[PDB]
Design a protein around this ligand. Structure first.
Ligand code: MG
Ligand code: MG
Length: 538
């Protein structure tokens, strides 16, 4: 089926919805979190590997118990190379060096870098420079570019893009991140430069510092307040898991999937690592991100009519039972209680029970289960954390103290929930009480890097690609294998939490030489325990 492979991996004008560059951008943006098939990878792997969710069958089975599954691992590769990245490549190619299309071209180059970053931060070496060119240039069988070289190209592409943007030129018309404000595109591009500079800070400290400092000084500057956060706009659409929903990117499919195809039996239960970080630190977001719900009246298609038992649990002294890494909602079975709230519901309703069991395991709050939840690309809060870490590393990034940058990042991360998810606001007094106690910055460099990156991990909950990248890069939080929680007997894929995903096996058939050459650079095996180039330690 080389024919289908070739058709699917290159933009075919005769079959493609459109080759208009502005339209290509719109559809690529929506795909990022709108592709319901692709989002399975995050529920299956990332959210377990970062120990944020655990207990849903899918999360625990795949990532929580290290089940290697080449088809499940393939989703980012397939989805991006056969749709958004290929289409962005086609659009970029057609607008390159056209003086009348410098803004759309520059924006395409920025978003091309962003999508490619997700691919390389998942798999390592991957097609980039030669990708998507079969119909444009007759160039098939693209080489897998080395990750080091991909990162070099990120910095160069982003720099050139910010230098070519000119608000006097072409209008960017279907842009669901910034409604064509190309100044905000410059801010995003320079912020991505910060992200990628910090990413390479362990493997190449000299280059990291230089790129970080270059980005701060670059045309348009960086994202310095939340109004320039890069968030893809999604519409409210009913959640459907019928066959036609898999081609509908209008709604946030990550939110759909975290609600679930089986929402009553397999909701998004929180992992103990994350719930306990929040709860034990008195984090104001504990019960903004999570609640305990009884779902006996909840429909199969939306998180309406759930019964919030969180406050009753607290009043009655019932312990929350978040899921350790490796645990299912049913294993170990939690200690429950008889609910007064649910007993009232049970009056003259045989559907309902008053006896809570798995309802004592914290669940993702309804605010994060909406079709119109944003698609998070990058935030001002993250920029603050990157600046804080650069400052601890003694880079030359301005006059603000590392501690103040850190505190600004935490405040922004908390406010992000208020502004974008309808969560209850956090007051100055609440913020100060937290930052003065368990949210404090710390005294030693290691304490400070731990605080920064732990706070980043919480911020990246809604951005699982970046969450997993930053956990691997920074080493924080320090996570233990499911083996350390009692689940070692089940870890078929090996004891250690995976640090990358393997290449799709069909690459062996359809791009064999390139595939074999990439695998040879890792020593000749394709192993999800192999560290990526930027990832210097497990
Ligand atoms: Mg690492
Ligand atoms: Mg070998």
């Amino acid at each position: 089926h080389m024919d289908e492979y070739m058709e699917n991996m290159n933009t075919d004008p005769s079959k493609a919805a459109t080759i208009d560059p502005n339209a290509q951008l719109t559809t690529a943006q929506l795909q990022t979190y709108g592709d319901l098939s692709m989002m399975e990878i995050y529920r299956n792997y990332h959210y377990a590997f970062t120990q944020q969710l655990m207990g849903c069958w899918n999360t625990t089975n795949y990532g929580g118990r290290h089940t290697l599954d080449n088809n499940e691992m393939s989703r980012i590769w397939t989805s991006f190379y056969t749709q958004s990245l290929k289409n962005i490549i086609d659009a970029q190619y057609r607008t390159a060096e056209d003086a009348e299309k410098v803004n759309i071209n520059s924006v395409l180059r920025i978003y091309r870098v962003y999508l490619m970053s997700i691919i390389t931060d998942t798999y390592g070496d991957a097609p980039f420079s030669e990708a998507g060119l079969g119909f444009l240039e007759g160039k098939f069988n693209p080489k897998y570019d080395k990750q080091e070289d991909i990162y070099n190209a990120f910095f160069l592409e982003l720099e050139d893009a910010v230098n070519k943007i000119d608000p006097t030129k072409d209008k960017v018309t279907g842009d669901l991140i910034y409604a064509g404000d190309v100044t905000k595109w410059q801010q995003l591009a320079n912020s991505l430069r910060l992200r990628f500079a910090m990413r390479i800070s362990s493997v190449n400290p000299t280059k990291a510092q230089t790129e970080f400092e270059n980005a701060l000084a670059a045309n348009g500057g960086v994202i310095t307040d939340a109004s320039s956060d890069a968030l893809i706009k999604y519409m409210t659409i009913a959640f459907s898991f019928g066959q036609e929903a898999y081609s509908d990117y209008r709604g946030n499919s990550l939110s759909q999937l975290l609600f679930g195809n089986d929402p009553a039996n397999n909701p998004s239960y929180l992992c103990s690592t994350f719930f306990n970080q929040l709860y034990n630190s008195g984090d104001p977001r504990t019960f903004k991100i999570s609640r305990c719900y009884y779902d006996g009246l909840m429909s199969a298609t939306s998180p309406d009519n759930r019964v919030d038992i969180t406050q009753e649990m607290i009043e009655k002294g019932i312990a929350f039972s978040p899921r350790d890494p490796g645990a299912y909602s049913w294993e170990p079975w939690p200690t429950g209680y008889d609910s007064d709230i649910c007993a009232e519901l049970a009056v003259n309703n045989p559907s309902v029970t008053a006896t809570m069991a798995r309802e004592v395991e914290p669940k993702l709050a309804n605010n994060f289960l909406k079709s119109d939840n944003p698609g998070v690309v990058m935030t001002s809060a993250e920029v603050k954390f990157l600046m804080a870490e650069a400052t601890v590393k003694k880079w030359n990034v301005g006059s603000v103290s590392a501690e103040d940058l850190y505190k600004q990042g935490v405040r922004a991360a908390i406010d992000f929930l208020t502004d974008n998810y309808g969560c209850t606001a956090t007051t100055d007094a609440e913020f100060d009480a937290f930052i003065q106690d368990k949210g404090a910055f710390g005294h030693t460099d290691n304490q400070k890097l731990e605080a920064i990156n732990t706070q980043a991990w919480i911020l990246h909950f809604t951005n699982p690609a970046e969450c997993w990248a930053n956990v691997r890069r920074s080493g924080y939080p320090k996570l233990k294998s499911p083996a350390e929680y009692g689940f070692g007997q089940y870890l078929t894929g090996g004891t250690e939490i995976p640090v990358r995903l393997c290449y799709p096996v069909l690459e062996s058939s359809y791009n064999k030489k390139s595939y074999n050459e990439a695998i040879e650079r890792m020593g000749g095996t394709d192993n999800w325990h192999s560290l990526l180039w930027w990832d210097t330690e497990n």
